[PDB]
Amino acid sequence: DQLNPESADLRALAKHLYDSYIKSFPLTKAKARAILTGKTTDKSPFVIYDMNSLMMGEDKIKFKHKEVAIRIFQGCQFRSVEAVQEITEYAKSIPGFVNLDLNDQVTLLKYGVHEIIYTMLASLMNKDGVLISEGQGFMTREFLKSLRKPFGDFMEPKFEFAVKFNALELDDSDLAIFIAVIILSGDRPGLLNVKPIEDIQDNLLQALELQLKLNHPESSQLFAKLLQKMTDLRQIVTEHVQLLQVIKKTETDMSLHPLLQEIYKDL
Numbered sequence: 001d002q003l004n005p006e007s008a009d010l011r012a013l014a015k016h017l018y019d020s021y022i023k024s025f026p027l028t029k030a031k032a033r034a035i036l037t038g039k040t041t042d043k044s045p046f047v048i049y050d051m052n053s054l055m056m057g058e059d060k061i062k063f064k065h066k067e068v069a070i071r072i073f074q075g076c077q078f079r080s081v082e083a084v085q086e087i088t089e090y091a092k093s094i095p096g097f098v099n100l101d102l103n104d105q106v107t108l109l110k111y112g113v114h115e116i117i118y119t120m121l122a123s124l125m126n127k128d129g130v131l132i133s134e135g136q137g138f139m140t141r142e143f144l145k146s147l148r149k150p151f152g153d154f155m156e157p158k159f160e161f162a163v164k165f166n167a168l169e170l171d172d173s174d175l176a177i178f179i180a181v182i183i184l185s186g187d188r189p190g191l192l193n194v195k196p197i198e199d200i201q202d203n204l205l206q207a208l209e210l211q212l213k214l215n216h217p218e219s220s221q222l223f224a225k226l227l228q229k230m231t232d233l234r235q236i237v238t239e240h241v242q243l244l245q246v247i248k249k250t251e252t253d254m255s256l257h258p259l260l261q262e263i264y265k266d267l
């Protein structure tokens with residue numbers, strides 16, 4: 001750790017990513033945690049904890065998307081497609097990203113967006129449930145587990161991931177760099193020019209390590225633990241696609257949103 005022009009550049013990169021992240025993502029972790037504790041001055045979210053409150057909340061909240069379990073399943077797909085858009089806008093602000101070959105930009109987003117979705121879902125989760133509709137609702141973990149087979153399973157691994165990930169106590173300034181690192185992964189299948197991606201990622205990794213050393217004086221293991229989480233996330237994505245296939249095997253009339261079908265196609 002020294003104050004030299006390289007470290008000043010790395011702090012400027014971290015600040016740029018934070019400022020962009022705040023612009024691209026409506027509900028930050030900082031705001032989400034204030035809502036979850038009730039410390040916000042905003043109105044409380046509507047809590048969905050059973051079938052009755054699900055129906056009352058659908059009448060209260062403007063959801064942009066059958067029976068209950070299918071409606072929730074579809075609402076998650078619609079949120080996912082929205083999130084793809086937000087993450088794409090964020091990726092355009094990562095220095096160097098839009099100068100990569102446009103096919104590599106697309107490949108990096110295809111293989112990275114779900115890892116980012118699950119990372120940022122953790123910001124909205126506690127032990128009891130998840131904030132939905134940019135904080136207007138809160139849907140409980142046990143209500144999700146109560147949905148009829150084969151729909152009662154798919155959020156559980158995401159809550160399990162979140163409980164452990166949230167224990168690391170990252171803030172938005174940390175997360176903005178972490179999710180840039182994930183997007184700039186040079187080992188995604190089918191990339192045309194790996195070296196320029198790795199060069200960007202190495203710089204982001206340096207910015208992340210410096211940020212974590214400055215921002216978390218009471219951990220020295222945090223960077224290594226975050227590299228571990230990046231591997232965990234790929235397992236969560238794969239397991240989710242497998243879950244979706246199982247659902248399709250028995251609910252053959254289910255269909256994924258066409259954009260998710262393309263992302264999952266060669267995945």
Ligand SMILES: CCO[C@@H](Cc1ccc(OCCn2c(C)ccc2-c2ccc(SC)cc2)cc1)C(=O)O
Pocket residue numbers: 063071072073074075076077079080081117124130131132133134154240260
């Ligand atoms: C099954 C598809 O899974 C997806 C991956 C996936 C899984 C869960 C998920 O939570 C989203 C929960 N949320 C948020 C954070 C805002 C609005 C909703 C919401 C509001 C209302 C409802 S229904 C009243 C549902 C959701 C987002 C993406 C994929 O494979 O791309």
